[PDB]
Amino acid sequence: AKYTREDIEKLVKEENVKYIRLQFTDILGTIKNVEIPVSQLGKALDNKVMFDGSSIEGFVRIEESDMYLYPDLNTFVIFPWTAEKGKVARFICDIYNPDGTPFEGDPRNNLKRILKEMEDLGFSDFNLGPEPEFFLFKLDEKGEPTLELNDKGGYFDLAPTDLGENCRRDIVLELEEMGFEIEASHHEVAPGQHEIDFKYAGAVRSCDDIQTFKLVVKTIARKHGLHATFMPKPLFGVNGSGMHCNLSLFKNGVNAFFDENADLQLSETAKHFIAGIVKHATSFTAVTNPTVNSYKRLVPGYEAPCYVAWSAQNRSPLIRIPASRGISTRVEVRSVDPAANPYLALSVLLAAGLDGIKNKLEAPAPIDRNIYVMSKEERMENGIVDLPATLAEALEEFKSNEVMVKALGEHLFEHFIEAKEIEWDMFRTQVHPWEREQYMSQY
Amino acid sequence: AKYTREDIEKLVKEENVKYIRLQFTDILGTIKNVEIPVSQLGKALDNKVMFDGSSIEGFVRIEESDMYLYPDLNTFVIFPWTAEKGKVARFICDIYNPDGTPFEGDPRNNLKRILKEMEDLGFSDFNLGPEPEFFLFKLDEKGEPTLELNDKGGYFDLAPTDLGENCRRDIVLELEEMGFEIEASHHEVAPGQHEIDFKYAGAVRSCDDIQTFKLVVKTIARKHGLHATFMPKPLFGVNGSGMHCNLSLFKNGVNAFFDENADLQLSETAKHFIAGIVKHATSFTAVTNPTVNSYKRLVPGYEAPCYVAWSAQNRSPLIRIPASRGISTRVEVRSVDPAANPYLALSVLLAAGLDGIKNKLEAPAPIDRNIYVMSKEERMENGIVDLPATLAEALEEFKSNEVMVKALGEHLFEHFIEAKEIEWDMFRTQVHPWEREQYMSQY
Ligand SMILES: Nc1ncnc2c1ncn2[C@@H]1O[C@H](COP(=O)(O)OP(=O)(O)O)[C@@H](O)[C@H]1O
Ligand SMILES: Nc1ncnc2c1ncn2[C@@H]1O[C@H](COP(=O)(O)OP(=O)(O)O)[C@@H](O)[C@H]1O
Ligand SMILES: N[C@@H](CCC(=O)O)C(=O)O
Ligand SMILES: [Mg+2]
Ligand SMILES: [Mg+2]
Ligand SMILES: [Mg+2]
Ligand SMILES: [Mg+2]
């Protein structure tokens, strides 16, 4: 819909595009990209460009399998940042096997398929409002990220005034030319920590503005002599950077979670959906939380989720439901972090949503009383189960779950476990400066 | 054709050329040149320019011998980089003895002399689609290369973002203006390592294209305060730059390798061509990888062609056949590194393919099973040899080969070895820090 191949080949001629960055996204969620000169647009829009597909596998690839790049014309974007010989153009593309089939291991197809299956139960959209938090660090002469922050502000503070840096201001001003839709942005809890929340949109267009985001950020910050990072827990002792995820289901252009009469204004749809997120939470974390590091943030203390349960408005509840109902009816999942793969976070979250409406799952009693406060005893009296505390735990959990391990397929899943099992392997064989300074002299 | 003498004389007035590089390659692929004021354009065009042809031998030159420079008007080009007075231009020249005979020593001639052979056998064009890789290092105070890589990218990543340096993108753009037809380009397996892939072209059109590239690269990389090097493996235990060579024998303007009526769709020629490439493989490695360092890359692990054979998809096969087909039926030779002299690379690759064709050689069992994953004797099961492991080894083989020699000719072969038996000597007589690190206290 959004664009047509005639609008494009006209626009590239108009704007003077001279470079085409045909971007995609590997499995760890990194921003892959094979770039061609503009002279090579025809071949591109024909869906002919071949690139080594084994890349989608990341550092755990072995042999090269040629694959094709099918661009999505409704993702075209002309970067503000000029090159000395014209401007640069982007194109988000799906990966296809050599023959004709889509490559099953492509996180973007994988979300189309699970989304296909969403409409197999009759729902129209699956909309997303992400609240992705990031940090700004200074740089030394050498282009080397230090560990000093661009400021010393706190929650909702006035970040660097409009006379200077304001990386966040200028970051948001550059995205809006780009035809973005940002809700608002505020300084977050820790010095140097910032946030830019998004106006919600269908999953796919959402998981694509979630990548684009990260890129314009790491771009714009660099420009001002900074380093920007979505690492969940950069600095021990300070706030972590979590990327919440406001989720809503539509049917027939209408929000399904809302129900005037029923309890809380939540239909059996909204109610059942929940129950499955809860069943499957502990499991699917290993995806919404890919790294060794995240679990340093998911340590009780800094208003991070550490417990499976949902509230009216609790301290740090794992599943909130924001004040607003009706159409803005939404379930907040506040445990995802900007290291998550957006395609594989929405593929899996979508999963436990439909696994709960399918088998009509019984939403358990919502804990309204401070979940932290409870001793380590009454913690069980309400069946409030903690989450996995180390990437390993998270992976044995998910490794087992029949449902999660279907919402990824046999390719996407089998690989993932390996990269992460390698990753963990590196963390646990390592000897950090801690071990050494806690042990060398005491023992 | 491309350019009549009348044609060129036009553009050098109009475009205000004030300098001219009569450019040619020495025996080791180094780009040489004798430069002249534009005031001296008539003299070169009339082929009367004399220079010392002994320079072609490199460092192994002894006696000073006068020689002639004949430019290929089809290689005229202006460089999009102006000097204080005017522009600078150039030609790729062929070298002739004081009596209008070609110099048996010029690498560009010996590729003509060997492409001639292809016509005696009955073919029309021998196409080439190089995939040359390269590293960018930082520059210290003095303007000297350091060991700092230009970025931290990885396989098919978004290499430097479009905001800041971006050497890669800037080299793709620049080369577009220079009538260069670039296919694509990505970020390569190691940090600071890059690839820019070529559209297939005749042998010598491409080799002219491969040299010029190296020049443009180093030239722009310098401009961004970087150091672009084409070293097969400038860093131990870091992936090394290579340069696969996609080859495809044409006849009657048609890909003589395709044929739905054969195994895997490979004409009886494609089969024969592979037969001879394999016959000669251990022998021509002393030329496609012409440095004491080339072989510190041919160590198993960081993905490289240690072993000899041809399959559908494997960890790093010597010969490959990409998905693509039809006119796009080619024989990728994955062991060539960017250390090879184009004209002498092809001289030996061509010969082998022609020895297989001409001599109805039979292509062996394409080892479709992964080879890396086999033991020295479990690998001996099949007819699988690794290549030379030192330049010493690679040269003794090369010499003992009748066809290879007859593929470079008296002069080249002679000087080539001479020079290469010196490098080994310089290197086996050296005493490296490793040797000290290891033995000085051990013993
Ligand atoms: N139906 C929905 N689905 C997903 N996200 C939503 C939905 N409605 C709102 N959001 C998200 O909630 C945040 C604010 O939305 P808004 O509708 O203004 O909430 P409120 O009614 O509480 O003011 C945004 O970050 C947005 O992305
Ligand atoms: N006929 C040919 N002979 C030699 N090399 C070729 C030929 N056709 C393509 N190549 C090379 O193979 C590489 C892969 O290109 P690709 O886009 O897959 O080709 P195609 O679209 O023709 O199948 C390129 O770097 C290109 O230079
Ligand atoms: N020379 C390496 C290059 C690595 C790469 O480009 O993937 C190879 O032959 O595989
Ligand atoms: Mg927040
Ligand atoms: Mg919030
Ligand atoms: Mg490559
Ligand atoms: Mg290749």
mmCIF file of C-alpha atoms in Angstrom, chain B residues 33-315:
data_model
loop_
_atom_site.group_PDB
_atom_site.id
_atom_site.type_symbol
_atom_site.label_atom_id
_atom_site.label_comp_id
_atom_site.label_asym_id
_atom_site.label_seq_id
_atom_site.Cartn_x
_atom_site.Cartn_y
_atom_site.Cartn_z
ATOM 1 C CA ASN B 33 53.837 4.510 -13.446
ATOM 2 C CA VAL B 34 55.821 6.983 -15.457
ATOM 3 C CA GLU B 35 54.082 10.358 -15.177
ATOM 4 C CA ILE B 36 54.305 13.241 -17.690
ATOM 5 C CA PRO B 37 52.920 16.771 -18.261
ATOM 6 C CA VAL B 38 49.853 16.885 -20.545
ATOM 7 C CA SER B 39 52.117 18.955 -22.828
ATOM 8 C CA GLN B 40 53.500 15.503 -23.689
ATOM 9 C CA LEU B 41 50.246 13.758 -24.661
ATOM 10 C CA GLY B 42 51.089 13.387 -28.350
ATOM 11 C CA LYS B 43 54.308 11.523 -27.621
ATOM 12 C CA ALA B 44 52.654 8.765 -25.540
ATOM 13 C CA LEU B 45 49.734 8.405 -27.952
ATOM 14 C CA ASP B 46 52.279 7.896 -30.739
ATOM 15 C CA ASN B 47 53.885 5.188 -28.549
ATOM 16 C CA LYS B 48 57.327 6.854 -28.372
ATOM 17 C CA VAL B 49 57.619 7.061 -24.554
ATOM 18 C CA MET B 50 60.745 5.328 -23.273
ATOM 19 C CA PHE B 51 61.126 4.124 -19.702
ATOM 20 C CA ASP B 52 63.375 1.611 -17.908
ATOM 21 C CA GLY B 53 61.656 -1.766 -18.445
ATOM 22 C CA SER B 54 63.905 -3.449 -15.856
ATOM 23 C CA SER B 55 61.669 -1.907 -13.222
ATOM 24 C CA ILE B 56 59.052 -4.542 -14.181
ATOM 25 C CA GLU B 57 61.275 -7.129 -12.430
ATOM 26 C CA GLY B 58 60.871 -5.167 -9.215
ATOM 27 C CA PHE B 59 63.807 -5.429 -6.834
ATOM 28 C CA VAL B 60 65.420 -8.285 -8.796
ATOM 29 C CA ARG B 61 66.233 -5.920 -11.679
ATOM 30 C CA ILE B 62 69.952 -5.621 -12.421
ATOM 31 C CA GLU B 63 70.868 -4.156 -15.807
ATOM 32 C CA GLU B 64 69.009 -1.062 -17.009
ATOM 33 C CA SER B 65 67.090 -1.825 -20.261
ATOM 34 C CA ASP B 66 65.192 0.804 -22.316
ATOM 35 C CA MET B 67 61.561 -0.060 -23.197
ATOM 36 C CA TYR B 68 58.378 1.391 -24.777
ATOM 37 C CA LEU B 69 54.925 2.215 -23.402
ATOM 38 C CA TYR B 70 51.795 1.715 -25.524
ATOM 39 C CA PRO B 71 48.600 3.021 -23.830
ATOM 40 C CA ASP B 72 45.180 1.276 -24.164
ATOM 41 C CA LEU B 73 42.888 4.177 -25.132
ATOM 42 C CA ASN B 74 39.953 2.078 -23.797
ATOM 43 C CA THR B 75 41.419 2.552 -20.297
ATOM 44 C CA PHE B 76 41.534 6.348 -20.374
ATOM 45 C CA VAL B 77 40.106 7.799 -17.184
ATOM 46 C CA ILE B 78 40.162 11.054 -15.240
ATOM 47 C CA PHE B 79 40.588 10.813 -11.471
ATOM 48 C CA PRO B 80 37.854 12.712 -9.545
ATOM 49 C CA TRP B 81 40.692 14.217 -7.435
ATOM 50 C CA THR B 82 42.098 17.599 -8.574
ATOM 51 C CA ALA B 83 45.636 18.979 -8.084
ATOM 52 C CA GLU B 84 46.369 22.701 -7.415
ATOM 53 C CA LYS B 85 46.705 23.436 -11.158
ATOM 54 C CA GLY B 86 44.423 21.002 -13.046
ATOM 55 C CA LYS B 87 43.072 17.437 -13.214
ATOM 56 C CA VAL B 88 45.111 14.214 -13.522
ATOM 57 C CA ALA B 89 44.456 11.338 -16.016
ATOM 58 C CA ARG B 90 45.941 7.972 -16.956
ATOM 59 C CA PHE B 91 46.130 4.926 -19.237
ATOM 60 C CA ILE B 92 47.010 1.281 -18.625
ATOM 61 C CA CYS B 93 50.035 0.754 -20.883
ATOM 62 C CA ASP B 94 51.368 -2.412 -22.481
ATOM 63 C CA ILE B 95 55.183 -2.832 -22.618
ATOM 64 C CA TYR B 96 57.152 -3.331 -25.878
ATOM 65 C CA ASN B 97 60.847 -4.035 -26.546
ATOM 66 C CA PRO B 98 62.805 -1.268 -28.343
ATOM 67 C CA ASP B 99 61.611 -2.980 -31.570
ATOM 68 C CA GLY B 100 57.771 -2.873 -31.463
ATOM 69 C CA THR B 101 57.528 -6.455 -30.120
ATOM 70 C CA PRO B 102 55.616 -7.083 -26.919
ATOM 71 C CA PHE B 103 57.850 -7.557 -23.865
ATOM 72 C CA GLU B 104 57.619 -11.205 -22.766
ATOM 73 C CA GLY B 105 58.020 -9.843 -19.225
ATOM 74 C CA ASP B 106 54.851 -7.802 -18.944
ATOM 75 C CA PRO B 107 52.108 -9.501 -16.930
ATOM 76 C CA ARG B 108 49.440 -7.792 -19.080
ATOM 77 C CA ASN B 109 50.958 -9.306 -22.236
ATOM 78 C CA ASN B 110 51.148 -12.850 -20.803
ATOM 79 C CA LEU B 111 47.405 -12.728 -20.109
ATOM 80 C CA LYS B 112 46.886 -11.709 -23.757
ATOM 81 C CA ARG B 113 49.238 -14.483 -24.880
ATOM 82 C CA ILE B 114 47.252 -16.950 -22.736
ATOM 83 C CA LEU B 115 43.800 -15.571 -23.747
ATOM 84 C CA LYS B 116 45.071 -16.093 -27.329
ATOM 85 C CA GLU B 117 45.368 -19.810 -26.508
ATOM 86 C CA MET B 118 41.645 -19.838 -25.707
ATOM 87 C CA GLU B 119 40.892 -18.776 -29.297
ATOM 88 C CA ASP B 120 43.071 -21.549 -30.819
ATOM 89 C CA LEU B 121 40.918 -23.973 -28.711
ATOM 90 C CA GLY B 122 37.644 -22.405 -29.837
ATOM 91 C CA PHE B 123 36.247 -19.959 -27.213
ATOM 92 C CA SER B 124 35.285 -16.208 -27.238
ATOM 93 C CA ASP B 125 35.445 -14.562 -23.791
ATOM 94 C CA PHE B 126 36.749 -15.596 -20.358
ATOM 95 C CA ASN B 127 34.799 -13.592 -17.751
ATOM 96 C CA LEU B 128 35.806 -12.702 -14.181
ATOM 97 C CA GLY B 129 33.880 -11.417 -11.179
ATOM 98 C CA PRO B 130 36.433 -10.728 -8.406
ATOM 99 C CA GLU B 131 35.410 -10.612 -4.749
ATOM 100 C CA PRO B 132 38.440 -8.672 -3.271
ATOM 101 C CA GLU B 133 38.501 -8.140 0.563
ATOM 102 C CA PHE B 134 40.480 -5.459 2.543
ATOM 103 C CA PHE B 135 41.297 -3.966 5.991
ATOM 104 C CA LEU B 136 41.379 -0.330 7.146
ATOM 105 C CA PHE B 137 43.737 0.637 9.986
ATOM 106 C CA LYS B 138 44.009 3.941 11.837
ATOM 107 C CA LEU B 139 46.804 6.476 11.265
ATOM 108 C CA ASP B 140 48.981 7.747 14.133
ATOM 109 C CA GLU B 141 50.455 11.273 14.535
ATOM 110 C CA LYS B 142 53.262 10.727 11.996
ATOM 111 C CA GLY B 143 50.857 9.566 9.289
ATOM 112 C CA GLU B 144 51.852 5.958 9.926
ATOM 113 C CA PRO B 145 49.540 2.920 10.047
ATOM 114 C CA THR B 146 48.822 1.694 13.551
ATOM 115 C CA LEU B 147 47.138 -1.573 14.486
ATOM 116 C CA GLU B 148 43.768 0.033 15.291
ATOM 117 C CA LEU B 149 41.002 -1.181 12.951
ATOM 118 C CA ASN B 150 38.669 1.508 11.520
ATOM 119 C CA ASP B 151 35.526 0.055 13.157
ATOM 120 C CA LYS B 152 34.217 -3.004 15.040
ATOM 121 C CA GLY B 153 31.803 -4.420 12.462
ATOM 122 C CA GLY B 154 31.266 -8.084 11.621
ATOM 123 C CA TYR B 155 29.802 -10.236 8.866
ATOM 124 C CA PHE B 156 27.347 -8.290 6.610
ATOM 125 C CA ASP B 157 26.844 -5.689 9.309
ATOM 126 C CA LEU B 158 26.024 -2.097 8.743
ATOM 127 C CA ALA B 159 29.674 -1.014 8.449
ATOM 128 C CA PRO B 160 30.427 2.484 9.713
ATOM 129 C CA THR B 161 27.056 4.253 9.894
ATOM 130 C CA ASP B 162 26.362 6.816 7.156
ATOM 131 C CA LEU B 163 27.254 9.578 9.630
ATOM 132 C CA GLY B 164 30.998 10.067 9.891
ATOM 133 C CA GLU B 165 33.913 8.442 8.078
ATOM 134 C CA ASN B 166 32.415 5.641 5.962
ATOM 135 C CA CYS B 167 35.343 4.762 3.747
ATOM 136 C CA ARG B 168 33.579 1.744 2.262
ATOM 137 C CA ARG B 169 30.489 3.548 0.996
ATOM 138 C CA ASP B 170 32.669 6.473 -0.141
ATOM 139 C CA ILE B 171 34.793 4.092 -2.258
ATOM 140 C CA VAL B 172 31.751 2.475 -3.839
ATOM 141 C CA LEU B 173 30.331 5.896 -4.760
ATOM 142 C CA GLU B 174 33.648 7.334 -6.098
ATOM 143 C CA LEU B 175 34.220 4.243 -8.281
ATOM 144 C CA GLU B 176 30.721 4.622 -9.752
ATOM 145 C CA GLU B 177 31.621 7.970 -11.267
ATOM 146 C CA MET B 178 34.777 6.390 -12.744
ATOM 147 C CA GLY B 179 32.629 4.277 -15.041
ATOM 148 C CA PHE B 180 33.096 1.400 -12.656
ATOM 149 C CA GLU B 181 30.289 -1.060 -12.472
ATOM 150 C CA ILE B 182 29.996 -2.198 -8.902
ATOM 151 C CA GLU B 183 27.708 -5.098 -7.990
ATOM 152 C CA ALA B 184 27.410 -4.714 -4.172
ATOM 153 C CA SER B 185 29.504 -4.457 -0.976
ATOM 154 C CA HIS B 186 29.195 -5.428 2.684
ATOM 155 C CA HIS B 187 31.181 -5.418 5.918
ATOM 156 C CA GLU B 188 33.482 -8.486 6.243
ATOM 157 C CA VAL B 189 33.895 -11.194 8.962
ATOM 158 C CA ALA B 190 36.556 -9.249 10.913
ATOM 159 C CA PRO B 191 36.431 -5.702 12.450
ATOM 160 C CA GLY B 192 37.718 -3.188 9.924
ATOM 161 C CA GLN B 193 37.529 -5.734 7.144
ATOM 162 C CA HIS B 194 35.562 -4.863 3.951
ATOM 163 C CA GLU B 195 34.400 -6.266 0.589
ATOM 164 C CA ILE B 196 33.238 -4.624 -2.667
ATOM 165 C CA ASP B 197 32.208 -7.051 -5.358
ATOM 166 C CA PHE B 198 32.640 -6.631 -9.116
ATOM 167 C CA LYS B 199 30.401 -7.116 -12.139
ATOM 168 C CA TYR B 200 31.902 -9.834 -14.314
ATOM 169 C CA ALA B 201 34.014 -8.630 -17.251
ATOM 170 C CA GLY B 202 36.567 -10.051 -19.694
ATOM 171 C CA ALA B 203 39.792 -11.134 -18.021
ATOM 172 C CA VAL B 204 41.945 -8.126 -18.862
ATOM 173 C CA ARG B 205 39.037 -5.641 -18.540
ATOM 174 C CA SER B 206 38.570 -6.882 -15.001
ATOM 175 C CA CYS B 207 42.265 -7.074 -14.108
ATOM 176 C CA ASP B 208 42.537 -3.490 -15.260
ATOM 177 C CA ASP B 209 39.544 -2.969 -12.938
ATOM 178 C CA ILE B 210 41.149 -4.829 -10.029
ATOM 179 C CA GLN B 211 44.362 -2.878 -10.050
ATOM 180 C CA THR B 212 42.663 0.561 -10.374
ATOM 181 C CA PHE B 213 40.470 -0.493 -7.441
ATOM 182 C CA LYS B 214 43.365 -1.141 -5.074
ATOM 183 C CA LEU B 215 44.617 2.382 -6.056
ATOM 184 C CA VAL B 216 41.302 4.160 -5.495
ATOM 185 C CA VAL B 217 40.858 2.322 -2.178
ATOM 186 C CA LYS B 218 44.295 3.241 -0.761
ATOM 187 C CA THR B 219 43.756 6.783 -2.074
ATOM 188 C CA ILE B 220 40.402 7.419 -0.342
ATOM 189 C CA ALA B 221 41.476 5.520 2.814
ATOM 190 C CA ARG B 222 44.422 7.841 3.101
ATOM 191 C CA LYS B 223 41.941 10.741 2.661
ATOM 192 C CA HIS B 224 40.024 9.598 5.716
ATOM 193 C CA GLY B 225 43.247 9.236 7.683
ATOM 194 C CA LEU B 226 43.098 5.442 7.361
ATOM 195 C CA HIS B 227 45.345 2.722 6.001
ATOM 196 C CA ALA B 228 43.854 0.341 3.440
ATOM 197 C CA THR B 229 45.926 -2.820 3.013
ATOM 198 C CA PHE B 230 45.360 -5.951 0.960
ATOM 199 C CA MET B 231 47.414 -8.270 3.183
ATOM 200 C CA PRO B 232 46.242 -11.895 3.173
ATOM 201 C CA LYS B 233 46.336 -11.994 6.967
ATOM 202 C CA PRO B 234 47.722 -8.834 8.696
ATOM 203 C CA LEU B 235 46.649 -10.156 12.106
ATOM 204 C CA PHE B 236 47.124 -13.607 13.474
ATOM 205 C CA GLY B 237 43.886 -15.201 14.671
ATOM 206 C CA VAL B 238 41.726 -12.741 12.797
ATOM 207 C CA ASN B 239 39.934 -13.722 9.590
ATOM 208 C CA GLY B 240 42.062 -12.958 6.528
ATOM 209 C CA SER B 241 41.249 -11.116 3.312
ATOM 210 C CA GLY B 242 40.854 -13.260 0.187
ATOM 211 C CA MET B 243 39.720 -12.727 -3.382
ATOM 212 C CA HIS B 244 37.526 -15.479 -4.901
ATOM 213 C CA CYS B 245 37.520 -15.465 -8.690
ATOM 214 C CA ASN B 246 34.249 -16.355 -10.372
ATOM 215 C CA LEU B 247 35.252 -17.676 -13.804
ATOM 216 C CA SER B 248 33.070 -18.562 -16.774
ATOM 217 C CA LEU B 249 34.218 -19.747 -20.202
ATOM 218 C CA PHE B 250 32.124 -18.306 -23.042
ATOM 219 C CA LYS B 251 32.014 -19.439 -26.695
ATOM 220 C CA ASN B 252 29.902 -17.774 -29.374
ATOM 221 C CA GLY B 253 28.859 -15.185 -26.741
ATOM 222 C CA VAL B 254 27.206 -17.973 -24.696
ATOM 223 C CA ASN B 255 28.090 -19.491 -21.325
ATOM 224 C CA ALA B 256 29.889 -22.706 -22.335
ATOM 225 C CA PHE B 257 29.455 -24.018 -18.776
ATOM 226 C CA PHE B 258 25.657 -24.219 -18.665
ATOM 227 C CA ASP B 259 23.742 -27.168 -20.158
ATOM 228 C CA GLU B 260 20.498 -28.553 -18.748
ATOM 229 C CA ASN B 261 21.633 -31.766 -20.396
ATOM 230 C CA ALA B 262 24.280 -32.744 -17.809
ATOM 231 C CA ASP B 263 25.183 -33.440 -14.201
ATOM 232 C CA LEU B 264 23.914 -30.589 -12.033
ATOM 233 C CA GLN B 265 23.480 -28.754 -15.377
ATOM 234 C CA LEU B 266 27.219 -28.581 -16.109
ATOM 235 C CA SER B 267 28.299 -28.797 -19.750
ATOM 236 C CA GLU B 268 30.909 -31.406 -20.675
ATOM 237 C CA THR B 269 33.264 -28.440 -20.797
ATOM 238 C CA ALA B 270 32.568 -27.081 -17.289
ATOM 239 C CA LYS B 271 33.322 -30.643 -16.127
ATOM 240 C CA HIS B 272 36.613 -30.773 -18.052
ATOM 241 C CA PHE B 273 37.545 -27.278 -16.928
ATOM 242 C CA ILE B 274 37.169 -28.286 -13.268
ATOM 243 C CA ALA B 275 39.165 -31.435 -14.063
ATOM 244 C CA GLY B 276 42.230 -29.458 -15.063
ATOM 245 C CA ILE B 277 41.933 -26.784 -12.356
ATOM 246 C CA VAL B 278 42.204 -29.652 -9.837
ATOM 247 C CA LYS B 279 45.072 -31.357 -11.711
ATOM 248 C CA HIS B 280 47.095 -28.164 -11.345
ATOM 249 C CA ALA B 281 45.841 -26.770 -8.027
ATOM 250 C CA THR B 282 48.847 -27.473 -5.801
ATOM 251 C CA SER B 283 51.022 -26.166 -8.605
ATOM 252 C CA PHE B 284 49.493 -22.689 -9.249
ATOM 253 C CA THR B 285 49.177 -21.805 -5.527
ATOM 254 C CA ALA B 286 52.692 -20.405 -5.597
ATOM 255 C CA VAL B 287 51.258 -17.633 -7.844
ATOM 256 C CA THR B 288 47.703 -16.953 -6.715
ATOM 257 C CA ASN B 289 49.151 -16.568 -3.169
ATOM 258 C CA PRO B 290 52.592 -15.065 -3.786
ATOM 259 C CA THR B 291 53.701 -13.958 -0.312
ATOM 260 C CA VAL B 292 55.394 -15.522 2.745
ATOM 261 C CA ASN B 293 52.214 -14.335 4.522
ATOM 262 C CA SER B 294 49.572 -15.786 2.124
ATOM 263 C CA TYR B 295 49.982 -19.166 3.838
ATOM 264 C CA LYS B 296 49.460 -17.879 7.404
ATOM 265 C CA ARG B 297 45.895 -17.474 6.037
ATOM 266 C CA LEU B 298 45.695 -21.009 4.618
ATOM 267 C CA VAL B 299 45.640 -22.360 8.172
ATOM 268 C CA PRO B 300 42.386 -24.245 8.889
ATOM 269 C CA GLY B 301 39.799 -22.474 11.052
ATOM 270 C CA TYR B 302 39.045 -18.865 10.197
ATOM 271 C CA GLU B 303 37.209 -20.197 7.132
ATOM 272 C CA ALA B 304 39.616 -20.584 4.181
ATOM 273 C CA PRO B 305 40.227 -23.168 1.375
ATOM 274 C CA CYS B 306 42.889 -25.412 2.983
ATOM 275 C CA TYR B 307 41.790 -28.412 0.859
ATOM 276 C CA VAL B 308 41.258 -29.303 -2.863
ATOM 277 C CA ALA B 309 37.776 -30.146 -4.377
ATOM 278 C CA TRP B 310 34.363 -28.825 -5.620
ATOM 279 C CA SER B 311 30.872 -29.118 -4.016
ATOM 280 C CA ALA B 312 27.353 -27.615 -3.719
ATOM 281 C CA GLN B 313 27.959 -26.040 -0.244
ATOM 282 C CA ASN B 314 30.784 -26.692 2.301
ATOM 283 C CA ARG B 315 32.874 -25.033 5.177
#
